[PDB]
Amino acid sequence: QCVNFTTRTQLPPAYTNSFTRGVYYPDKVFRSSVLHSTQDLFLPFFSNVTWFHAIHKRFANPVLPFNDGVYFASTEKSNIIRGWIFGTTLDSKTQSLLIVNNATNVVIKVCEFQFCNDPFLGVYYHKNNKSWMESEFRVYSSANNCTFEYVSQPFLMDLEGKQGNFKNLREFVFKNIDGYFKIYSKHTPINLVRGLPQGFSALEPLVDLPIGINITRFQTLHISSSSGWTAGAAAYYVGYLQPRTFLLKYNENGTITDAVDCALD
């Protein structure tokens, strides 16, 4: 199923300062109490990250370029953002990548998808058991050749609650290198209203799938009488990775605690 979502306010693009965020573990090797220098595609420190958000009034799901890999971050309450579209044509002429982060696990699927202009997911509210249940995935109209599929280790995430400010920070790195698509991730608690949180944490690798397709663009997947809805407040940030040398500090428990960007100043 596909619906043309027309209810939205038009505002100019916003930018914000990424203090020290966008660092991830580049390899699967343990290190502790050492200073290790490494160069890889990271988000440069103190760079202008682009800002998008859903309000009341706002619902950002536009197609955006994907050049050299992208840092994604999300400041959120009530679990509104549910996935991403990655690909080149997104209309069944070629394969395309669909990633969805539902209540229980992460699902990754590569098909000859024919995507919708304004895609969205849906939740049944108070259906008999009086619990909110993810039940709709109105994102593509057809999937002609589903070559790749992956399901992550399962987890339990709630689908209910209300707070006066954003409580969860979810950070992801997506790279498409030599046919191998890499996903890194980290979750961090926050107490912010409308800005990119100040702090530092390294993203742990999640999965490396040899999907072999071209990804040049992506599109966000947000969760919702047949059109027009109230968008629950949630916001995300988009930055592009650059080849940068960093000096990484490992603590006694083998966790990156600090980093120095060799081209910063």
């Binding site: 699967k28 090797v29 343990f30 040899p210 428990n253």
Partner: protein
């Protein structure tokens, strides 16, 4: 050890002193071999024994993963006209571990096979299948004349004769776009100095050796830089600790003493490194336990001797060695053993009465030949 000092000094007479001789090194008690318990064999029947391969302009690329290899069946096969490697020896393939393995399958003329090797050039190497200068992998081929050749010519196999620019290593261009060799533009299907980009092979059973069709499979796998998915047919042995062993954990070959480590590897991590960026701990690939790796004890051997004109009695210092190691190396009689801060001293009597230094041993200790 006295003959070893006479030998080391190149003299039949040796003055009173302490002289260095061949280093002591504790040897492996036994080997350890550990790999994940995977069983299924790789798709070598579907790669090398397929009914037909593709034309060289659209060469097939098949992924081989999560399987055990058996290269003795392939290398020992009399059907193969060449089985040549460029970054490994064919005999080492069964004694070796593989990160990613890709099979590149295609058909070309025997005269054109010379261009498939790494560093080559010419219409095939330039327009359809190029290997890198530092290519690691193996090129396998066999005469397929009975399978793919016809008396009038099996023109179903094509190559690329025309292209706008040369292609990069492992590039594949299936496109049939008409090529303009002249400076004048063209339209439709053909024209003056305008050519269809592909050309068919003249595969006939009357062709001379070299002019006949050969099937080529090139294995372009990678080694020792990523988590393994294809492996050698090696049975995993039992795992032991608290002993000096020749271990191998998923290709991590080395000699050392294994012990239970307190290093907290993260869920995605398998190997642990020190400040020197060298392996000092390993998680076993079958049983999820982390072992601290330390190499066996070793150090120089110092021979303590009075003058040759004095006595043939000598003492031996195993530098940097714990006394425990001596019985392990079963002077093994002992009853003269003493651990010094320089190492394990054997063949010398420990005396509590302090004297003036004579032959220096190190760490405050000296030896002398006395009544």
């Amino acid at each position: 050890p006295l003959s070893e000092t006479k030998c080391t000094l190149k003299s039949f007479t040796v003055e009173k002193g302490i002289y260095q001789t061949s280093n002591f090194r504790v040897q492996p008690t036994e080997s350890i071999v550990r790999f994940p318990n995977i069983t299924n064999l790789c798709p070598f029947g579907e790669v090398f024994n397929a009914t037909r391969f593709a034309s060289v302009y659209a060469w097939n690329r098949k992924r081989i993963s999560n399987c055990v290899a058996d290269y003795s069946v392939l290398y020992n096969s009399a059907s193969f006209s060449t089985f040549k490697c460029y970054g490994v020896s064919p005999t080492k393939l069964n004694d070796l571990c593989f990160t990613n393995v890709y099979a590149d399958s295609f058909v070309i003329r025997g005269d054109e096979v010379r261009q498939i090797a790494p560093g080559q050039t010419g219409n095939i190497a330039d327009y359809n299948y190029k290997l890198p200068d530092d290519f690691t992998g193996c090129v396998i081929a066999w005469n397929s004349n009975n399978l793919d050749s016809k008396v009038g010519g099996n023109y179903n196999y094509l190559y690329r004769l025309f292209r706008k620019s040369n292609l990069k290593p492992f590039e594949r261009d299936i496109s049939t776009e008409i090529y303009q060799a002249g400076s004048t533009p063209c339209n439709g299907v053909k024209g003056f100095n305008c050519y269809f980009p592909l050309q068919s092979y003249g595969f006939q059973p009357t062709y001379g050796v070299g002019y006949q069709p050969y099937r080529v499979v090139v294995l372009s796998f990678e080694l020792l830089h990523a988590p393994a998915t294809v492996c050698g047919p090696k049975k995993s042995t039992n795992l032991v600790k608290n002993k000096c062993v020749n271990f191998n954990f998923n290709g991590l070959t080395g000699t050392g003493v294994l012990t239970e480590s307190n290093k907290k590897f993260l869920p995605f991590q398998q190997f642990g490194r020190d400040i020197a960026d060298t392996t000092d701990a390993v998680r076993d690939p079958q049983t999820l336990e982390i072992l601290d790796i330390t190499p066996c004890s070793f150090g120089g051997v110092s021979v303590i001797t009075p003058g040759t004109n004095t006595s043939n009695q000598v003492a031996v210092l195993y530098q940097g060695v714990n006394c425990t190691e001596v019985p392990v190396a079963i002077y093994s009689t002992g009853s003269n053993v003493f651990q010094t801060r320089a190492g394990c001293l054997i063949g010398a009597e420990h005396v509590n009465n302090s004297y003036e230094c004579d032959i220096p041993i190190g760490a405050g200790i000296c030896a002398s030949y006395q009544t």
